[PDB]
Amino acid sequence: KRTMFNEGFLGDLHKVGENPQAYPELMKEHLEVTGGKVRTRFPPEPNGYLHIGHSKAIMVNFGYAKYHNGTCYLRFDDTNPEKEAPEYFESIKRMVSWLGFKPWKITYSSDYFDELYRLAEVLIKNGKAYVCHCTAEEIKRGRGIGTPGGERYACKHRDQSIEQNLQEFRDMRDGKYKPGEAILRMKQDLNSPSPQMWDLIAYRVLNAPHPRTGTKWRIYPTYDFTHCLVDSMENITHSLCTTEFYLSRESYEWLCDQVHVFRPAQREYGRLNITGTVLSKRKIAQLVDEKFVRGWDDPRLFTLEAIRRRGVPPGAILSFINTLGVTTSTTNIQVVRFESAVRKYLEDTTPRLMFVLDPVEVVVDNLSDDYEELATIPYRPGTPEFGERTVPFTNKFYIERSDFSENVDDKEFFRLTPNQPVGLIKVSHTVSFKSLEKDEAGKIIRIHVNYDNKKKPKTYIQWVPISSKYNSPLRVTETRVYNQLFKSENPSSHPEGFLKDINPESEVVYKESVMEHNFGDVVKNSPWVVDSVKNSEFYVEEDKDSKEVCRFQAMRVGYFTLDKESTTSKVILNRIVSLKDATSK
Ligand SMILES: [Br-]
Ligand SMILES: [Cl-]
Ligand SMILES: [Zn+2]
Q: Which residues are catalytic?
Protein backbone atom coordinates (compact mmCIF):
# COMPACT_ATOMS: atom_id res chain seq x y z
CA LYS A 1 0.00 0.00 0.00
CA ARG A 2 2.98 2.29 0.58
CA THR A 3 3.88 4.63 -2.27
CA MET A 4 5.80 7.87 -2.75
CA PHE A 5 2.70 9.81 -1.69
CA ASN A 6 2.42 8.46 1.87
CA GLU A 7 6.10 8.14 2.78
CA GLY A 8 9.39 9.99 2.40
CA PHE A 9 9.19 13.68 1.49
CA LEU A 10 5.53 13.71 0.47
CA GLY A 11 4.54 11.60 3.47
CA ASP A 12 6.23 14.01 5.87
CA LEU A 13 4.43 17.04 4.43
CA HIS A 14 2.16 19.17 6.58
CA LYS A 15 -1.62 18.89 6.52
CA VAL A 16 -3.63 21.62 4.79
CA GLY A 17 -3.98 24.63 7.10
CA GLU A 18 -1.22 23.54 9.47
CA ASN A 19 1.65 25.49 7.89
CA PRO A 20 3.02 28.47 9.89
CA GLN A 21 1.87 32.05 9.31
CA ALA A 22 3.31 35.44 10.26
CA TYR A 23 -0.23 36.76 10.68
CA PRO A 24 -2.81 34.44 12.31
CA GLU A 25 -5.96 35.77 10.62
CA LEU A 26 -4.81 34.95 7.07
CA MET A 27 -5.33 31.19 7.44
CA LYS A 28 -9.10 31.63 7.72
CA GLU A 29 -9.63 32.77 4.13
CA HIS A 30 -7.09 30.22 2.90
CA LEU A 31 -9.14 27.37 4.34
CA GLU A 32 -12.39 28.87 3.06
CA VAL A 33 -11.07 29.11 -0.50
CA THR A 34 -9.30 25.73 -0.55
CA GLY A 35 -12.12 24.08 1.39
CA GLY A 36 -9.35 22.36 3.33
CA LYS A 37 -8.30 20.49 0.19
CA VAL A 38 -4.78 20.21 -1.22
CA ARG A 39 -3.79 22.73 -3.88
CA THR A 40 -0.51 22.28 -5.73
CA ARG A 41 0.86 23.66 -8.99
CA PHE A 42 3.15 22.68 -11.83
CA PRO A 43 4.71 26.00 -12.90
CA PRO A 44 6.95 25.41 -15.95
CA GLU A 45 8.43 28.23 -18.03
CA PRO A 46 6.93 27.84 -21.51
CA ASN A 47 10.24 28.60 -23.24
CA GLY A 48 11.31 25.06 -24.13
CA TYR A 49 10.30 21.41 -24.33
CA LEU A 50 10.06 19.40 -21.12
CA HIS A 51 12.61 16.65 -20.51
CA ILE A 52 12.62 13.48 -18.36
CA GLY A 53 13.49 15.40 -15.19
CA HIS A 54 10.15 17.23 -15.37
CA SER A 55 8.28 13.92 -15.15
CA LYS A 56 9.14 13.98 -11.44
CA ALA A 57 7.78 17.50 -10.97
CA ILE A 58 4.61 16.51 -12.81
CA MET A 59 4.06 13.31 -10.83
CA VAL A 60 4.92 14.99 -7.53
CA ASN A 61 2.57 17.96 -7.92
CA PHE A 62 -0.34 16.40 -9.83
CA GLY A 63 0.10 13.09 -8.01
CA TYR A 64 0.10 14.49 -4.49
CA ALA A 65 -3.03 16.52 -5.20
CA LYS A 66 -4.79 13.54 -6.78
CA TYR A 67 -3.80 11.25 -3.90
CA HIS A 68 -5.46 13.65 -1.45
CA ASN A 69 -8.51 14.28 -3.64
CA GLY A 70 -7.32 17.84 -4.19
CA THR A 71 -6.33 19.90 -7.22
CA CYS A 72 -3.25 21.00 -9.14
CA TYR A 73 -2.79 24.13 -11.27
CA LEU A 74 -1.00 24.08 -14.58
CA ARG A 75 0.67 27.48 -14.38
CA PHE A 76 2.70 28.76 -17.31
CA ASP A 77 5.44 30.83 -15.68
CA ASP A 78 5.49 33.60 -18.27
CA THR A 79 6.92 36.20 -15.88
CA ASN A 80 9.58 37.18 -18.42
CA PRO A 81 8.54 38.68 -21.79
CA GLU A 82 9.33 36.30 -24.67
CA LYS A 83 8.62 35.90 -28.37
CA GLU A 84 5.43 34.01 -29.23
CA ALA A 85 6.05 30.25 -29.01
CA PRO A 86 2.70 28.37 -28.86
CA GLU A 87 4.34 24.99 -29.51
CA TYR A 88 5.87 24.98 -26.01
CA PHE A 89 2.53 25.65 -24.33
CA GLU A 90 0.72 22.92 -26.24
CA SER A 91 3.54 20.41 -25.75
CA ILE A 92 3.46 21.02 -21.99
CA LYS A 93 -0.30 20.41 -21.97
CA ARG A 94 0.16 17.22 -23.99
CA MET A 95 2.89 15.88 -21.69
CA VAL A 96 0.86 16.54 -18.54
CA SER A 97 -2.04 14.72 -20.19
CA TRP A 98 0.19 11.96 -21.56
CA LEU A 99 1.33 11.10 -18.04
CA GLY A 100 -2.33 10.78 -17.05
CA PHE A 101 -2.84 13.99 -15.07
CA LYS A 102 -5.50 16.70 -15.30
CA PRO A 103 -5.12 20.38 -14.33
CA TRP A 104 -8.18 21.73 -12.50
CA LYS A 105 -7.32 25.12 -13.97
CA ILE A 106 -4.73 26.54 -16.37
CA THR A 107 -3.18 29.88 -15.43
CA TYR A 108 -0.34 32.24 -16.35
CA SER A 109 1.93 34.23 -14.05
CA SER A 110 1.09 37.18 -16.30
CA ASP A 111 -2.57 36.87 -15.26
CA TYR A 112 -1.52 38.55 -12.02
CA PHE A 113 0.61 41.48 -13.25
CA ASP A 114 -2.01 43.99 -12.03
CA GLU A 115 -2.14 42.55 -8.52
CA LEU A 116 1.61 42.01 -8.50
CA TYR A 117 2.15 45.68 -9.31
CA ARG A 118 -0.24 46.69 -6.52
CA LEU A 119 1.62 44.52 -4.02
CA ALA A 120 4.86 46.15 -5.17
CA GLU A 121 3.40 49.51 -4.16
CA VAL A 122 2.33 47.96 -0.85
CA LEU A 123 5.89 46.72 -0.35
CA ILE A 124 7.16 50.25 -1.03
CA LYS A 125 4.57 51.86 1.25
CA ASN A 126 5.58 49.45 4.02
CA GLY A 127 9.16 50.70 3.72
CA LYS A 128 10.39 47.37 2.37
CA ALA A 129 11.38 48.30 -1.18
CA TYR A 130 13.30 51.09 -2.91
CA VAL A 131 14.01 52.28 -6.43
CA CYS A 132 17.70 51.80 -7.21
CA HIS A 133 19.67 53.29 -10.10
CA CYS A 134 22.90 51.35 -9.60
CA THR A 135 24.58 49.63 -12.54
CA ALA A 136 25.01 45.85 -12.57
CA GLU A 137 28.63 46.30 -11.48
CA GLU A 138 27.75 48.73 -8.69
CA ILE A 139 25.18 46.24 -7.42
CA LYS A 140 27.76 43.44 -7.43
CA ARG A 141 30.20 45.65 -5.51
CA GLY A 142 27.53 46.42 -2.91
CA ARG A 143 27.12 42.67 -2.48
CA GLY A 144 30.86 42.29 -1.88
CA ILE A 145 31.53 40.69 -5.26
CA GLY A 146 35.18 39.26 -10.00
CA THR A 147 35.15 37.12 -6.87
CA PRO A 148 32.84 37.22 -3.79
CA GLY A 149 33.63 37.68 -0.09
CA GLY A 150 34.18 41.43 -0.15
CA GLU A 151 32.59 44.03 2.12
CA ARG A 152 28.86 44.59 1.67
CA TYR A 153 27.21 48.01 1.93
CA ALA A 154 24.11 49.92 0.87
CA CYS A 155 23.88 52.41 -1.98
CA LYS A 156 22.41 55.88 -1.45
CA HIS A 157 19.13 54.77 -3.05
CA ARG A 158 18.36 52.44 -0.13
CA ASP A 159 17.71 55.37 2.23
CA GLN A 160 15.09 56.97 -0.02
CA SER A 161 11.77 58.03 1.49
CA ILE A 162 8.59 56.09 0.78
CA GLU A 163 7.30 59.09 -1.18
CA GLN A 164 10.33 59.22 -3.49
CA ASN A 165 10.40 55.46 -4.01
CA LEU A 166 6.69 55.39 -4.84
CA GLN A 167 7.00 58.25 -7.34
CA GLU A 168 10.08 56.76 -8.99
CA PHE A 169 8.42 53.34 -9.28
CA ARG A 170 5.43 54.96 -10.97
CA ASP A 171 7.85 56.79 -13.26
CA MET A 172 9.38 53.39 -14.09
CA ARG A 173 5.89 52.15 -14.94
CA ASP A 174 5.19 55.22 -17.09
CA GLY A 175 8.36 54.94 -19.17
CA LYS A 176 10.53 57.72 -17.77
CA TYR A 177 13.50 55.35 -17.44
CA LYS A 178 15.34 53.32 -20.06
CA PRO A 179 15.94 49.60 -19.43
CA GLY A 180 18.61 49.16 -16.76
CA GLU A 181 18.43 52.77 -15.56
CA ALA A 182 16.06 51.89 -12.73
CA ILE A 183 15.03 48.83 -10.75
CA LEU A 184 12.82 48.18 -7.75
CA ARG A 185 14.74 46.28 -5.08
CA MET A 186 13.46 44.57 -1.96
CA LYS A 187 14.79 46.24 1.18
CA GLN A 188 15.99 43.14 3.01
CA ASP A 189 19.31 42.74 4.83
CA LEU A 190 22.68 43.28 3.15
CA ASN A 191 24.37 42.18 6.38
CA SER A 192 22.77 38.74 6.16
CA PRO A 193 25.08 35.85 5.21
CA SER A 194 22.47 34.68 2.67
CA PRO A 195 22.72 36.06 -0.89
CA GLN A 196 18.93 35.75 -1.14
CA MET A 197 18.59 38.63 1.34
CA TRP A 198 20.90 41.05 -0.48
CA ASP A 199 18.12 43.35 -1.70
CA LEU A 200 16.77 41.20 -4.52
CA ILE A 201 15.58 42.91 -7.68
CA ALA A 202 11.77 42.89 -7.78
CA TYR A 203 11.01 44.89 -10.95
CA ARG A 204 12.98 45.80 -14.07
CA VAL A 205 12.34 48.15 -16.99
CA LEU A 206 12.27 46.10 -20.21
CA ASN A 207 10.23 48.03 -22.79
CA ALA A 208 9.24 44.81 -24.55
CA PRO A 209 5.77 43.53 -25.39
CA HIS A 210 4.25 40.44 -23.77
CA PRO A 211 2.32 37.70 -25.62
CA ARG A 212 -0.55 37.83 -23.11
CA THR A 213 -0.56 41.50 -22.07
CA GLY A 214 0.65 43.18 -25.26
CA THR A 215 2.28 46.59 -24.91
CA LYS A 216 0.60 47.40 -21.59
CA TRP A 217 3.71 46.93 -19.45
CA ARG A 218 7.08 48.67 -19.58
CA ILE A 219 8.08 46.98 -16.33
CA TYR A 220 7.97 43.34 -15.29
CA PRO A 221 8.45 41.49 -11.99
CA THR A 222 11.20 38.93 -11.37
CA TYR A 223 10.81 35.29 -10.34
CA ASP A 224 11.85 36.31 -6.82
CA PHE A 225 8.82 38.60 -6.72
CA THR A 226 6.20 36.58 -8.62
CA HIS A 227 6.66 33.02 -7.37
CA CYS A 228 5.56 33.38 -3.73
CA LEU A 229 2.93 36.04 -4.43
CA VAL A 230 1.24 34.06 -7.21
CA ASP A 231 1.36 30.94 -5.02
CA SER A 232 -0.36 33.05 -2.37
CA MET A 233 -3.00 34.46 -4.72
CA GLU A 234 -3.72 30.93 -5.95
CA ASN A 235 -3.91 29.67 -2.36
CA ILE A 236 -1.34 26.94 -2.94
CA THR A 237 -1.37 24.70 0.13
CA HIS A 238 1.81 22.87 -0.89
CA SER A 239 4.33 24.72 -3.06
CA LEU A 240 6.71 21.98 -4.14
CA CYS A 241 10.00 22.84 -5.85
CA THR A 242 13.48 21.31 -6.01
CA THR A 243 16.19 21.66 -3.35
CA GLU A 244 18.08 23.68 -5.95
CA PHE A 245 16.02 26.57 -4.54
CA TYR A 246 16.12 25.77 -0.81
CA LEU A 247 18.02 28.99 -0.10
CA SER A 248 15.24 31.08 -1.64
CA ARG A 249 12.64 29.85 0.86
CA GLU A 250 13.85 32.58 3.22
CA SER A 251 13.16 35.38 0.74
CA TYR A 252 10.03 33.55 -0.43
CA GLU A 253 8.54 33.81 3.06
CA TRP A 254 9.99 37.27 3.71
CA LEU A 255 8.20 38.86 0.75
CA CYS A 256 4.81 37.38 1.69
CA ASP A 257 5.24 38.70 5.23
CA GLN A 258 6.25 42.20 4.10
CA VAL A 259 3.07 42.72 2.06
CA HIS A 260 0.86 40.94 4.59
CA VAL A 261 -0.45 38.12 2.39
CA PHE A 262 -1.01 34.43 3.04
CA ARG A 263 2.38 32.76 3.34
CA PRO A 264 2.33 29.48 1.40
CA ALA A 265 4.47 26.51 2.41
CA GLN A 266 7.38 26.02 0.03
CA ARG A 267 8.96 22.63 0.62
CA GLU A 268 11.83 21.28 -1.46
CA TYR A 269 12.51 17.79 -2.80
CA GLY A 270 15.59 16.46 -4.59
CA ARG A 271 15.31 16.66 -8.36
CA LEU A 272 15.87 13.83 -10.81
CA ASN A 273 19.22 14.09 -12.60
CA ILE A 274 19.64 11.92 -15.69
CA THR A 275 23.27 11.36 -16.67
CA GLY A 276 24.61 10.01 -19.96
CA THR A 277 22.89 12.53 -22.22
CA VAL A 278 22.44 16.28 -22.73
CA LEU A 279 19.38 18.13 -21.42
CA SER A 280 20.24 21.80 -21.99
CA LYS A 281 18.20 23.61 -24.64
CA ARG A 282 21.37 24.99 -26.22
CA LYS A 283 23.04 21.58 -26.63
CA ILE A 284 19.93 19.75 -27.86
CA ALA A 285 19.35 22.67 -30.23
CA GLN A 286 22.81 22.00 -31.68
CA LEU A 287 21.95 18.33 -32.17
CA VAL A 288 18.73 19.22 -33.98
CA ASP A 289 20.09 22.16 -35.98
CA GLU A 290 23.16 20.23 -37.17
CA LYS A 291 21.02 17.20 -38.02
CA PHE A 292 22.57 14.82 -35.48
CA VAL A 293 18.96 13.96 -34.67
CA ARG A 294 15.72 14.23 -36.67
CA GLY A 295 14.10 16.74 -34.32
CA TRP A 296 13.13 17.61 -30.76
CA ASP A 297 11.10 14.40 -30.45
CA ASP A 298 13.82 12.17 -31.90
CA PRO A 299 13.70 8.87 -29.93
CA ARG A 300 17.40 9.24 -29.01
CA LEU A 301 16.73 12.40 -26.97
CA PHE A 302 15.34 12.60 -23.44
CA THR A 303 12.77 15.29 -24.00
CA LEU A 304 9.37 13.98 -22.89
CA GLU A 305 8.14 14.22 -26.48
CA ALA A 306 11.11 12.11 -27.59
CA ILE A 307 10.51 9.53 -24.88
CA ARG A 308 6.86 9.33 -25.92
CA ARG A 309 7.68 8.87 -29.61
CA ARG A 310 10.33 6.30 -28.69
CA GLY A 311 7.56 4.14 -27.23
CA VAL A 312 8.33 4.31 -23.51
CA PRO A 313 5.00 3.76 -21.72
CA PRO A 314 3.92 6.68 -19.51
CA GLY A 315 3.13 4.20 -16.73
CA ALA A 316 6.72 2.96 -16.82
CA ILE A 317 7.91 6.50 -16.11
CA LEU A 318 5.46 6.90 -13.22
CA SER A 319 6.41 3.51 -11.74
CA PHE A 320 10.10 4.32 -12.14
CA ILE A 321 9.73 7.62 -10.28
CA ASN A 322 7.78 5.95 -7.47
CA THR A 323 10.31 3.13 -7.09
CA LEU A 324 13.15 5.65 -6.78
CA GLY A 325 11.08 7.43 -4.14
CA VAL A 326 10.99 11.11 -3.27
CA THR A 327 13.10 12.66 -0.53
CA THR A 328 15.14 15.82 0.00
CA SER A 329 17.97 13.98 -1.76
CA THR A 330 18.41 14.14 -5.52
CA THR A 331 18.02 10.98 -7.58
CA ASN A 332 20.97 10.60 -9.93
CA ILE A 333 20.16 8.10 -12.65
CA GLN A 334 22.15 6.75 -15.57
CA VAL A 335 20.45 6.43 -18.95
CA VAL A 336 21.31 2.73 -18.83
CA ARG A 337 19.42 2.39 -15.55
CA PHE A 338 16.32 4.13 -16.92
CA GLU A 339 16.40 1.95 -20.03
CA SER A 340 16.69 -1.19 -17.89
CA ALA A 341 13.58 -0.16 -15.96
CA VAL A 342 11.67 0.38 -19.20
CA ARG A 343 12.83 -3.00 -20.48
CA LYS A 344 11.52 -4.81 -17.41
CA TYR A 345 8.21 -2.95 -17.59
CA LEU A 346 7.79 -3.96 -21.24
CA GLU A 347 8.65 -7.59 -20.46
CA ASP A 348 5.69 -7.64 -18.06
CA THR A 349 3.09 -5.93 -20.22
CA THR A 350 3.61 -6.53 -23.96
CA PRO A 351 2.20 -9.03 -26.46
CA ARG A 352 4.85 -11.13 -28.17
CA LEU A 353 5.07 -11.41 -31.95
CA MET A 354 7.28 -13.07 -34.52
CA PHE A 355 9.14 -10.44 -36.50
CA VAL A 356 12.16 -10.64 -38.81
CA LEU A 357 14.38 -7.58 -39.31
CA ASP A 358 16.52 -8.93 -42.13
CA PRO A 359 14.52 -11.75 -43.76
CA VAL A 360 15.88 -14.61 -45.83
CA GLU A 361 13.36 -16.71 -47.75
CA VAL A 362 13.20 -20.38 -46.77
CA VAL A 363 11.66 -23.08 -48.97
CA VAL A 364 10.62 -26.47 -47.60
CA ASP A 365 11.30 -29.02 -50.34
CA ASN A 366 9.37 -31.93 -48.82
CA LEU A 367 6.12 -30.10 -48.03
CA SER A 368 3.25 -29.62 -50.49
CA ASP A 369 1.72 -26.22 -51.27
CA ASP A 370 -1.50 -27.22 -49.52
CA TYR A 371 0.33 -28.19 -46.33
CA GLU A 372 -0.72 -25.98 -43.43
CA GLU A 373 0.26 -26.60 -39.82
CA LEU A 374 -1.65 -24.10 -37.70
CA ALA A 375 0.49 -23.05 -34.75
CA THR A 376 -1.58 -21.44 -32.01
CA ILE A 377 0.52 -19.20 -29.81
CA PRO A 378 -0.45 -17.26 -26.67
CA TYR A 379 0.15 -13.53 -27.06
CA ARG A 380 2.06 -13.72 -23.78
CA PRO A 381 2.81 -16.86 -21.74
CA GLY A 382 1.16 -16.77 -18.31
CA THR A 383 -1.18 -13.97 -19.37
CA PRO A 384 -4.62 -15.47 -20.16
CA GLU A 385 -6.23 -12.03 -20.54
CA PHE A 386 -4.11 -11.46 -23.67
CA GLY A 387 -5.55 -14.53 -25.39
CA GLU A 388 -3.94 -16.29 -28.32
CA ARG A 389 -3.50 -16.18 -32.09
CA THR A 390 -2.66 -18.62 -34.87
CA VAL A 391 0.19 -18.65 -37.39
CA PRO A 392 0.15 -21.01 -40.39
CA PHE A 393 3.31 -23.05 -40.95
CA THR A 394 3.61 -23.60 -44.70
CA ASN A 395 6.33 -24.71 -47.11
CA LYS A 396 7.62 -21.14 -47.44
CA PHE A 397 8.65 -18.69 -44.72
CA TYR A 398 11.20 -16.09 -43.65
CA ILE A 399 13.86 -16.30 -40.95
CA GLU A 400 16.52 -13.87 -39.77
CA ARG A 401 19.65 -13.89 -41.91
CA SER A 402 21.50 -14.00 -38.58
CA ASP A 403 19.82 -17.32 -37.75
CA PHE A 404 21.69 -19.12 -40.52
CA SER A 405 25.43 -19.69 -40.70
CA GLU A 406 27.69 -21.63 -43.05
CA ASN A 407 30.30 -21.91 -40.28
CA VAL A 408 29.79 -25.42 -38.94
CA ASP A 409 32.77 -25.13 -36.56
CA ASP A 410 31.22 -22.32 -34.50
CA LYS A 411 30.32 -24.00 -31.22
CA GLU A 412 28.65 -20.80 -30.00
CA PHE A 413 26.14 -20.79 -32.87
CA PHE A 414 22.98 -22.71 -31.98
CA ARG A 415 20.76 -21.87 -34.96
CA LEU A 416 20.62 -23.21 -38.54
CA THR A 417 23.73 -24.49 -40.30
CA PRO A 418 24.38 -27.14 -42.98
CA ASN A 419 25.38 -29.47 -40.14
CA GLN A 420 22.81 -28.38 -37.56
CA PRO A 421 18.98 -28.39 -37.75
CA VAL A 422 16.98 -25.64 -36.05
CA GLY A 423 13.65 -25.55 -34.25
CA LEU A 424 10.85 -23.17 -35.17
CA ILE A 425 8.71 -21.57 -32.47
CA LYS A 426 5.55 -23.64 -31.85
CA VAL A 427 6.25 -25.82 -34.89
CA SER A 428 6.21 -29.59 -34.34
CA HIS A 429 9.46 -30.57 -36.07
CA THR A 430 12.85 -29.08 -36.87
CA VAL A 431 14.02 -28.01 -40.31
CA SER A 432 17.32 -29.19 -41.77
CA PHE A 433 19.56 -27.58 -44.39
CA LYS A 434 19.54 -28.80 -47.99
CA SER A 435 21.08 -26.02 -50.06
CA LEU A 436 21.31 -22.25 -50.45
CA GLU A 437 21.33 -19.77 -53.31
CA LYS A 438 23.37 -16.58 -53.49
CA ASP A 439 23.34 -13.63 -55.88
CA GLU A 440 26.46 -12.45 -57.70
CA ALA A 441 27.45 -10.44 -54.62
CA GLY A 442 27.47 -13.59 -52.49
CA LYS A 443 24.36 -12.56 -50.56
CA ILE A 444 22.10 -15.47 -49.61
CA ILE A 445 18.68 -15.00 -51.22
CA ARG A 446 17.14 -18.42 -50.57
CA ILE A 447 17.62 -21.45 -48.35
CA HIS A 448 16.15 -24.87 -49.08
CA VAL A 449 15.35 -27.09 -46.11
CA ASN A 450 13.59 -30.32 -45.20
CA TYR A 451 10.88 -30.54 -42.58
CA ASP A 452 12.13 -33.30 -40.28
CA ASN A 453 8.84 -35.17 -39.96
CA LYS A 454 10.39 -38.60 -40.55
CA LYS A 455 18.32 -34.79 -31.26
CA LYS A 456 16.36 -31.87 -29.81
CA PRO A 457 17.37 -28.61 -31.51
CA LYS A 458 19.66 -26.21 -29.66
CA THR A 459 17.20 -23.34 -30.09
CA TYR A 460 13.84 -22.30 -31.54
CA ILE A 461 13.79 -19.27 -33.83
CA GLN A 462 10.99 -16.98 -34.97
CA TRP A 463 9.58 -17.29 -38.47
CA VAL A 464 7.09 -15.49 -40.71
CA PRO A 465 5.20 -17.64 -43.21
CA ILE A 466 4.28 -16.84 -46.78
CA SER A 467 0.54 -17.49 -46.84
CA SER A 468 -1.83 -15.62 -49.13
CA LYS A 469 -4.73 -17.19 -47.24
CA TYR A 470 -3.77 -15.25 -44.11
CA ASN A 471 -2.14 -12.29 -45.88
CA SER A 472 1.26 -13.22 -44.47
CA PRO A 473 3.78 -11.63 -44.35
CA LEU A 474 2.87 -8.16 -43.21
CA ARG A 475 5.62 -6.09 -44.80
CA VAL A 476 7.27 -3.35 -42.77
CA THR A 477 8.64 -0.46 -44.80
CA GLU A 478 11.04 0.90 -42.20
CA THR A 479 12.29 -0.26 -38.81
CA ARG A 480 14.41 2.19 -36.81
CA VAL A 481 16.71 0.50 -34.31
CA TYR A 482 17.99 2.94 -31.71
CA ASN A 483 21.18 2.65 -29.71
CA GLN A 484 22.90 5.03 -27.29
CA LEU A 485 23.30 8.51 -28.75
CA PHE A 486 26.60 8.97 -26.92
CA LYS A 487 29.52 6.56 -26.55
CA SER A 488 30.26 7.51 -22.94
CA GLU A 489 28.27 8.09 -19.75
CA ASN A 490 29.55 11.66 -19.54
CA PRO A 491 29.50 13.21 -23.05
CA SER A 492 29.85 16.82 -21.86
CA SER A 493 33.26 15.97 -20.37
CA HIS A 494 34.57 14.78 -23.75
CA PRO A 495 37.75 16.73 -24.63
CA GLU A 496 36.70 17.83 -28.12
CA GLY A 497 33.16 18.65 -26.94
CA PHE A 498 29.99 16.62 -26.43
CA LEU A 499 29.28 16.40 -30.17
CA LYS A 500 32.45 14.32 -30.51
CA ASP A 501 31.10 11.71 -28.10
CA ILE A 502 28.31 10.87 -30.55
CA ASN A 503 27.71 7.21 -31.37
CA PRO A 504 27.74 6.67 -35.16
CA GLU A 505 25.33 3.73 -34.86
CA SER A 506 22.69 5.49 -32.75
CA GLU A 507 20.10 4.85 -35.48
CA VAL A 508 20.20 1.78 -37.72
CA VAL A 509 17.38 1.62 -40.27
CA TYR A 510 16.17 -1.69 -41.69
CA LYS A 511 14.08 -1.75 -44.86
CA GLU A 512 11.48 -4.35 -45.80
CA SER A 513 11.35 -6.39 -42.61
CA VAL A 514 8.54 -8.94 -42.29
CA MET A 515 5.96 -9.44 -39.57
CA GLU A 516 3.37 -12.10 -38.74
CA HIS A 517 -0.13 -11.22 -39.93
CA ASN A 518 -1.52 -10.93 -36.40
CA PHE A 519 0.20 -7.56 -35.98
CA GLY A 520 -3.05 -6.16 -37.36
CA ASP A 521 -4.97 -7.44 -34.34
CA VAL A 522 -2.25 -6.16 -32.01
CA VAL A 523 -2.56 -2.67 -33.48
CA LYS A 524 -6.35 -2.88 -33.25
CA ASN A 525 -6.36 -3.92 -29.59
CA SER A 526 -3.69 -1.49 -28.37
CA PRO A 527 -2.83 -0.54 -25.79
CA TRP A 528 -2.36 -4.02 -24.33
CA VAL A 529 -2.82 -3.77 -20.57
CA VAL A 530 -2.15 -6.69 -18.23
CA ASP A 531 -4.32 -6.99 -15.12
CA SER A 532 -1.44 -6.21 -12.75
CA VAL A 533 -1.00 -2.83 -14.43
CA LYS A 534 -4.73 -2.20 -14.74
CA ASN A 535 -5.07 -2.64 -10.97
CA SER A 536 -1.92 -0.74 -9.99
CA GLU A 537 -1.87 2.85 -8.72
CA PHE A 538 0.26 3.80 -11.73
CA TYR A 539 -2.10 2.79 -14.52
CA VAL A 540 -2.24 5.46 -17.21
CA GLU A 541 -5.11 5.32 -19.69
CA GLU A 542 -3.63 6.06 -23.11
CA ASP A 543 -5.18 7.33 -26.34
CA LYS A 544 -6.00 4.23 -28.40
CA ASP A 545 -5.42 6.21 -31.62
CA SER A 546 -1.84 7.19 -30.74
CA LYS A 547 0.74 5.30 -32.80
CA GLU A 548 3.10 4.68 -29.88
CA VAL A 549 0.56 2.67 -27.85
CA CYS A 550 1.08 -0.25 -30.25
CA ARG A 551 3.91 -1.77 -28.22
CA PHE A 552 5.05 -5.36 -28.58
CA GLN A 553 7.97 -7.69 -27.98
CA ALA A 554 9.55 -9.04 -31.14
CA MET A 555 10.69 -12.42 -29.81
CA ARG A 556 14.49 -12.75 -29.98
CA VAL A 557 14.73 -9.23 -31.44
CA GLY A 558 13.58 -6.51 -29.04
CA TYR A 559 10.70 -4.20 -28.10
CA PHE A 560 9.05 -2.12 -30.80
CA THR A 561 6.21 0.28 -31.46
CA LEU A 562 4.73 2.23 -34.36
CA ASP A 563 6.44 5.54 -35.10
CA LYS A 564 4.60 8.84 -35.44
CA GLU A 565 5.08 8.76 -39.23
CA SER A 566 3.68 5.23 -39.64
CA THR A 567 0.69 4.37 -41.82
CA THR A 568 -1.06 1.15 -42.85
CA SER A 569 0.46 1.54 -46.32
CA LYS A 570 3.98 2.29 -45.09
CA VAL A 571 4.57 0.78 -41.66
CA ILE A 572 7.35 2.39 -39.65
CA LEU A 573 8.57 0.86 -36.39
CA ASN A 574 10.79 2.22 -33.63
CA ARG A 575 12.72 -0.09 -31.34
CA ILE A 576 11.87 1.05 -27.82
CA VAL A 577 14.68 -0.93 -26.19
CA SER A 578 16.77 -4.03 -26.84
CA LEU A 579 15.66 -7.35 -25.36
CA LYS A 580 18.34 -7.54 -22.70
CA ASP A 581 20.78 -5.52 -20.64
CA ALA A 582 24.15 -5.05 -22.32
CA THR A 583 26.69 -7.86 -22.55
CA SER A 584 30.41 -7.61 -23.27
CA LYS A 585 29.35 -8.76 -26.74
BR1 LIG B 1 11.70 23.58 -9.09
CL1 LIG C 1 23.13 6.66 -36.64
ZN1 LIG D 1 21.40 51.81 -5.82
A: 45, 271, 281
